Each structure stands twice: as C-alpha cells, then as structure tokens.
C-alpha cells in the first residue's frame, strides 16, 4: 500500500535492535569473565550496569537531539550506524585473530559499550514517536493496531534474543554469538535506510526538554507577562510534580537491573542444569534464559492483568491507585532482593565446604552444589514488580501530565531508570572498596565465592525498603 511498508520497516528495525541489545546484555557478564577479559564479577556487573544505565540515560538526550535538530528519521539512521559501529567491537574482541589487531584492552570494550549504549538510547527514544507518526494519519484505531504490532515485535525480539543468542554465546561460541547481533544490527540499519524512501519524515519541531531547560534557567514560577507562555510553565510544573515519583522509583530500577548483571553472576555460581548430554563440551542451560523466562512470564500475565484482573476490579471497585500499585511493585522487588540475598548467603555457606565445577561459556566456575532453579523465585518476583511498578509509574506519570508532554514524560522515565542502574553500579563499586570489603578481592574470572553478594543484595533490599516506607508516608500524607 506504500504505507504499511513503512510500518513493517519500523517493526523489523525495532525487532532487530531489541534482539541485538538483549543479546549483548544477556551474556556481557559471561563475556567479561573470559579469555581476553579476566575481570572480576563485580567489574563485569558494574560494566553491564553502566551500559544499561547509559542506554536509558541517553533517551532524553536522544529525543532532544531528534526533536530539536537533525530530524527523527535521520537521527534514528545515524543512531543505527553508530550502534552498528559499537556492535562491531564485540565479535572482534571475541575472535582471537582480531583481538590482537584490536589489542588488557579495556579501552576497546569500553568504547564499544558506550557506542552501543548511545545507539540503543537514541533508537529507543526516537523509534516509538517515529512509528506513531508513521501510523498517526490513518487514525487512532490504526495507531492502536500498529502499537499492538510494535509491542509484540519488541517482546518477540527480546524473547528470540535471550533464547537463541544467549544459547549460542554460552554454549556454542562467543564469536558467532556476538556476530549474529552485529549481523542483525546491520540488517536493521539496511532496512531502515531502504525504508527511508517510504517513511513519513517530519521536520524537527523542537523537544519539550529545551523548553523545560529554559524554564529552569529562569529569565509559582514566573509565567504571565514575562518572556514565557502560560501552557509551557504549567507543563513544566506538571513535570516537576511527576519527578518525585521517579526519584522514589530509582532504587526499584537499581534492584530490577540487578536481574541481568549480578543475578546472572550468581547463576554462574549455582548448579546450572546441563541440557545436552551429547557431544563434546556439553551444552548447559543459558543463565540468561531465566531472564527470558521472566520475560515470558510477562507475556503470560500482561494480557491477563489487562483482561482478567483489571476489568474485574473495575467492576467491583477497590482497584488500587497508581501510587498503591507502585508501592506494591517496590515491595515485590524488595522481596526479590531479599530472596536473592538469602539464596546467596546459603550459597556461600554451601560453597565454603564443597563445590562443583562449571565450564559454562569458556571459563570454569566454582559453583555451589545448589540447583539453579532456586534462583527462579527472585526473578519471578522482579517480573511481578514490573507489572506493578513500571507500568503504574508511567501510568501515574501519564495521569498527572498533559498530552503535549508525551515522549518527554517517557524520556524522564527512561532517564530515571538509567539513574537507578547507575546507582546500582556505584553501590557495587562502593561496596567493592577496601573499607567495606564486601566485594574487595583479586579473584579473577568472577569467582564470587570470596565476595559477599548476600550483603550487597541485603543492602539493596534495605534501600528499597527505606524508599518504600518514605513513598508510603508521602502518599498517605498527600493523598
């Protein structure tokens, strides 16, 4: 039809770029504890946390760069090129032949990580408005159908990534398991460039973030006859009202982003089931599959909550408010952190006496004789926390904000999620110093047995609990 081709191109680019991002995040921890990189578990977790935090901090900046200048389609194109350039560094590092030419060489992998983070951030910020204005003209129902397709594309890309790419990286090889995400980024860039002919490109109107920055840099508030209009001032006031909810959600984002950086690290030191029983170097169950499981869990209860729980509660009343749902989600993620700490304490008690070796990936881990499935609850808890906090958070942020601040509220949501990831990385670094010594050692290849992830998880749970009590107090006082 000449228009559904543009929507299909947007969906394909979205699927490929989510697939590559999740392929990187699923086994970056395993890769950084590898032959080229004999990093500590704390260092690998910090690197992955910083990477995710960058991917979510660049969303407001990517959106501003797309809206104030450079357009949106061209911004996504340059972001995809930058993202592919960053992706290229990973298979080269994995391959022994090319790692020598590239380079230990921590600067190379840090450059690749920051490049990939900027690309993912800009694409994440700009793709959703791009798809919307691709489909806005037909009508709100067409937009709803396209966004159903977009949601399914995102989830499908994440699922296929966390399954296939993680299995290939952990079991088959890291070179192929990192070239496949690079290949899919290449195809995403190619398909976006090809669909540039059929895309509906809008001129840069100007992001609301520059207006907010001008308001904060003053000429309540000033408003009226001064050099600023009333609606922008009211909108910035609404954003300021929204901000404390995200400030409260920051520790939730820390503990949530722990699911793929330190939870995978703890998985590497549990008895991972072996699912091949055939051929040399028998394949083990990918540590990222748990995350995939959790994602699958979301797919099985996002519609349920949208079709069974929410309508029944709406009919019967007693439906919790957005703030109450956020509090429930923070309680659930606190429970996940506490369960992770309990499991890690039991793991450290067990591994002190006996151990089992696990040559998962390409490095041998002194895992405890504890089943990996004992880590299933905490992961599931985080998933529940998601459907109770993240959505609700944004939902509340959408309730107390005007329609004009669409994609500016969402940008702030991503920014504060990235801030939570950065806070988690900084907390891990702080507890890794000699004064505290929870993660202070010289144990290469991760080898968390000498560290204390139980103390780190307990600290995260305590911070989440303090934040939850403060949130409950302020919600009761205000509402």
């Amino acid at each position, epitope marked *: 039809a000449g228009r559904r081709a543009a929507c299909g191109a947007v969906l394909l680019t979205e699927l490929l770029e989510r697939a590559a991002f999740y392929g990187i995040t699923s086994n970056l921890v395993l890769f950084l504890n590898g*032959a080229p990189f004999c990093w500590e578990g704390a260092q690998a977790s910090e690197a992955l946390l910083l990477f995710m935090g960058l991917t979510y901090l660049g969303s407001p900046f990517g959106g501003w760069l797309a809206d104030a200048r450079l357009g949106r389609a061209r911004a996504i194109l340059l972001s995809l090129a930058l993202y592919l350039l960053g992706m290229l560094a990973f298979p080269l590092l994995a391959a022994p032949a090319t790692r020598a030419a590239l380079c230990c060489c921590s600067p190379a992998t840090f450059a690749g990580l920051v490049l990939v983070g900027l690309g993912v951030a800009t694409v994440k910020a700009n793709i959703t408005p791009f798809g919307a204005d691709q489909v806005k003209d037909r009508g709100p129902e067409a937009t709803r159908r396209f966004f159903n397709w977009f949601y399914w594309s995102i989830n499908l890309g994440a699922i296929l990534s966390l399954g296939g790419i993680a299995y290939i990286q952990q079991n088959v090889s890291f070179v192929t398991g990192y070239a496949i995400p690079t290949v899919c980024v290449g195809l995403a860039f190619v398909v976006f460039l090809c669909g540039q002919s059929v895309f509906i490109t809008k001129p840069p109107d100007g992001s609301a973030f520059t207006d907010m920055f001008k308001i904060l840099t003053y000429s309540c508030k000033m408003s009226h006859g001064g050099p600023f209009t009333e609606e922008k001032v009211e909108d910035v006031k609404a954003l300021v009202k929204i901000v404390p909810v995200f400030l409260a959600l920051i520790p939730y984002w820390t503990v949530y982003f722990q699911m793929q950086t330190t939870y995978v690290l703890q998985s590497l030191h549990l008895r991972i089931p072996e699912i091949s029983n055939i051929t040399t170097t*028998p394949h083990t169950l990918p540590a990222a599959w748990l995350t995939m499981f959790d994602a699958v869990l979301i797919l099985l209860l996002i519609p349920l909550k949208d079709k069974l729980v929410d309508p029944i509660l709406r009919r019967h009343g007693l439906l919790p408010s957005s703030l109450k749902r956020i509090a429930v989600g923070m309680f659930f993620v606190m429970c996940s952190a506490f369960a992770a700490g309990i499991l890690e304490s039991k793991r450290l008690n067990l591994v002190k006496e006996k151990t089992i070796n696990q*040559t998962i990936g390409n*490095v041998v881990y002194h895992a405890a004789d504890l089943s990996l499935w004992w880590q299933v609850p905490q992961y599931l808890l985080i998933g529940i926390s998601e459907i109770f906090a993240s959505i609700a958070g944004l939902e509340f942020a959408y309730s107390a904000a005007p329609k004009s601040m669409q994609s500016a509220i969402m940008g702030l949501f991503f920014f504060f999620s990235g801030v939570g990831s950065f806070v988690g990385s900084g907390l891990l670094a702080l507890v890794s110093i000699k004064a505290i010594g929870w993660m202070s050692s010289h*144990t290469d290849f991760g080898n968390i*047995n000498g560290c204390y992830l139980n103390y780190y998880f307990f600290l995260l749970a305590a911070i989440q609990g303090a934040t939850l009590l403060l949130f409950l107090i302020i919600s009761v006082k205000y509402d």
Partner: antibody, heavy 120, light 108 residues
C-alpha cells in the same frame, strides 16, 4: 618457560609443623588456582588441598582438613602449605599442580615435588 | 564425595597389544571433568587425557579415552615400551577431587 619448584621438605618429628613452599615462574601466578597433591611412597596420588586464583575458594582433603593450611602470595609468586600436628601417614612427596580456569580445567603443569618424612 | 576405582590396579601387557583400563565412579561425573594423568617412576605426573576424550600435548595417537557418566576407560591400540607407567583417573568436578586408585602398566 613455565616451571614449578618445591622446597621445605625434609625430616620432621611427628606432631611438628612444616611449611612447604612452591615457587612458580613462566606464567601469571595471579591466575591459575593451585593445588597441593601428595603421593605416599609406593602409594598412589592423593589430592591434599586447593586454593583458587584469589584465595577465595580453599578446599582440603578430609585427612588434612583441620591441620593443613594452603595459601598463596601472588606478588612474590609463591604457594605455601603450612601443616601442623604432623603424623606418620603424612610422609609423602608433595607436588604443586596448576589448575586452569579456561575452556578446560585440569592439572596441566606439575612441579618436581618435595619429599616430607614424618618419623624419628 | 566421589571415589574413583581403577580396574585393574596392576597389569602387564606385551608390546603391540590392546590395552584397556577402566575407572568407575561412586556417583555421576561429567565427562568434561575426568582426566587421566601418567606418572613414570621417579618423575612428576603429567596430564595424559583431558575430558576423557582428548589427548594432551605430546601424547601419542595410539592412546584414546572413552566412557561417560560413571564408567570411563583409557585405551592403547598398540602398547609400546615408553607406555609403561602408572595412570590415575581424576575427577575435577565435585569437591573433594580425589584421584583414582592408580593403574600400573608393565611390559610382558
């Protein structure tokens, strides 16, 4: 280039203490978690102790659990095994073996071993 | 606690003869973590077969590892004079990593 020498073995009265040292060269001793394995005269090999790359994982055989103590000094690239309450059955040749934390895990390199005799 | 029993504890095989020694485990041992070490008398031990299939560096091709799970085996297609030594099966899977009982191989 890689090599492992042992020292400290000798005659020890029963109930005494002795500290067997293993000097490593030709590789990065910070990596490659080490093992102490003893072989009694005309008996087979017996794994005694293991220490990880960063002393995080430390394990001993049930026969040397409460007596032997394995440690590593990375900056001077050495492996220590200090043993107390020595009895007669501890008389053996001790080797410091190198374990790999790479695609395959095994005792790739062994030292010549040092003989410890616990008798009178 | 896995104990490895080697059968036979001692055997003599003539030159150019089929040689087979078995190593059974008290529990399940992953095939990738079973190794065979060769020890000459008066010399330190040496990896011979890692992951019960792959020959180590310098190992003659006549040697071959086999087996999986509980029972494994080291095999010589055609035994030669330099092959007379003591072979130990070692599981490096579950702590404690006890060695095998040993299998002394002699010329007949």
């Amino acid at each position: 280039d890689v090599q492992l020498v042992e020292s400290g073995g000798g005659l020890v009265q029963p109930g005494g203490s002795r500290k067997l040292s293993c000097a490593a060269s030709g590789f990065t001793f910070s990596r490659f978690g080490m093992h102490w394995v003893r072989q009694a005269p005309e008996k087979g090999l017996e794994w005694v102790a293991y220490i990880s790359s960063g002393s995080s994982n430390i394990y001993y055989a049930d026969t040397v659990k409460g007596r032997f103590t394995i440690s590593r000094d990375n900056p001077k690239n050495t492996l220590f095994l200090q043993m107390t309450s020595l009895r007669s059955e501890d008389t053996a040749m001790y080797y410091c073996a190198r374990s790999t934390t790479i695609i395959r895990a095994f005792f790739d390199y062994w030292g010549q071993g040092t003989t410890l005799t616990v008798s009178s | 606690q896995i104990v490895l029993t080697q059968s036979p504890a001692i055997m003599s095989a003539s030159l150019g003869e089929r040689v087979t020694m078995t190593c059974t485990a008290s529990s399940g041992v992953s095939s990738s973590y079973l190794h065979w070490y060769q020890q000459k008398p008066g010399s330190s031990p040496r990896l011979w077969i890692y992951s019960t299939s792959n020959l180590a560096s310098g190992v003659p091709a006549r040697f071959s590892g086999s087996g999986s799970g509980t029972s494994y085996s080291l095999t010589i297609s055609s035994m030669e004079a330099e092959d007379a030594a003591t072979y130990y099966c070692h599981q490096y899977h579950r702590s404690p990593w006890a060695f095998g009982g040993g299998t002394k191989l002699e010329i007949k």
